Amino acid sequence: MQEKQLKAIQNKIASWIKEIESGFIDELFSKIGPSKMLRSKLMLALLNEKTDAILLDKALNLCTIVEMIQTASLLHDDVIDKATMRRKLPSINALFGNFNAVMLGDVFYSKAFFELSKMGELIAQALSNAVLRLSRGEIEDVFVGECFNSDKQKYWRILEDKTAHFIEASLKSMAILLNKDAKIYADFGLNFGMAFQIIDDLLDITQDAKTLGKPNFSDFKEGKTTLPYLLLYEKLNQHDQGLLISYFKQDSHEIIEWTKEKFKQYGIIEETLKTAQVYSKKALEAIKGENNLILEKLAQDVISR
């Protein structure tokens, strides 16, 4: 979204890490790679042409807090998922051990909350509550992930806790800071977040025409029964249901090929996509009144891969 502002947020994060004054932490931080900063792009979109410089800095600080929280959650998630990689490069836990990845995440969380306390109680509570739900969602995700899950309601709760509510809280917080209608943007954030994670789960099992890279097929192998698998399970005959369950947490090329044929057989890809489009439509609906081209741009683009 706006390069110069994202660049300023990137630099604020670096400054905040240096403020911790620890050569060891500087070392750990140097191994974390760039971020798309999707959340900052969404939040920055609420800024006005005439936002005063003092308020703009506060807004950049808010975006910095949100990105650091996001980074902290990813650091802990990589530990819990025993991930050795994050975007083709070695994870922090792979390079410095689980303990360091965990502490580094705590450092990101605490430094972020420290700065957050200067935002006021309304914003501080919205974001700190979002971090509480992110942690509840993470626990829910691995407990539900212990065995094949066919209860779609548990899936929806996890998506909302681990992804949707945080984006909702981030947008609501920026609206509050900029004295905008917090309800409208919280609503846009929640639905955008739901669509975003559904498409993300979709991209794990189906090709992104735009890239030649093949889908990772990382989810089911890791115990996550995402929407595609839930919708497929509801259409499979008894025999195939047995097979799908037997493939839970298994890892092989043949299982991937079988799964792709089954999704095609029951039109799961389009069915999954349509579920996300409902949320995408709701997001656009929420900001119908406003005239935010950036948000409308992002809300439409998430649905097209």
Next chain:
Amino acid sequence: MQEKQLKAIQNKIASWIKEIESGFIDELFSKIGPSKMLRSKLMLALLNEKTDAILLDKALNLCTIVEMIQTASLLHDDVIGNFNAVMLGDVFYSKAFFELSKMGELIAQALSNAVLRLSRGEIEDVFVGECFNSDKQKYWRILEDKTAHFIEASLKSMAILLNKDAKIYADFGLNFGMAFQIIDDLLDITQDAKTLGKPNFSDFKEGKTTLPYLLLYEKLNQHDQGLLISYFKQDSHEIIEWTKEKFKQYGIIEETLKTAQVYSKKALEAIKGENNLILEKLAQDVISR
């Protein structure tokens, strides 16, 4: 300490956990054992005889926040519990911070900075622990970040809440915290005063060159210094018994204790103006183990 108050805090932690509304979390929480709640005792000691009910409740909420931060750090520290520990730790930290959100900027910043510092401390401990350490200043920096500063911030925070001299109590907490951790390191290699039950000897084995080891290293001859360094991060009875004999040979136990007494005295001296019987008792007891 005040057992009725500690009980109320214990119950607040339980109700705060239930407010998260997660059966999975309730299950993980039921596995958490009791706590001595040393930090609540120090903080509760600042309350006046006739503190009003509204303020009292705020004070209890503050102790609850501090005890949950303490539990969260212990959980993450045990990762050095599977990933259940990392998860439950985040739950404790986040709930505590959410409630801290309602406490006013000064207290919110004091405690969040404390968590930042103790996390920095943990990291310093791991990195410094990659090889034998003879630099005592690195040890003190670690003790301050990982243990002393949080106790300092907890007392400072309660002082602010109760409108007392924050400076006096922060000073008490910092010094008490240094003594506390020194004694803790001593208890890892010496027998405790009335219990059966031998010392764990977990520190040096884990790569931590604690005060006893630093003071010993300073007295050993070249031959024994070489042995000690070679025993770094090793686990054997031979090493344990050799170390015990060396501590005795150079009066290290007593030298370590005197060091802790210095901070204990500085702590007492900070609240001398005060006449706080509970705090004085604690600073004293910390040293008698």
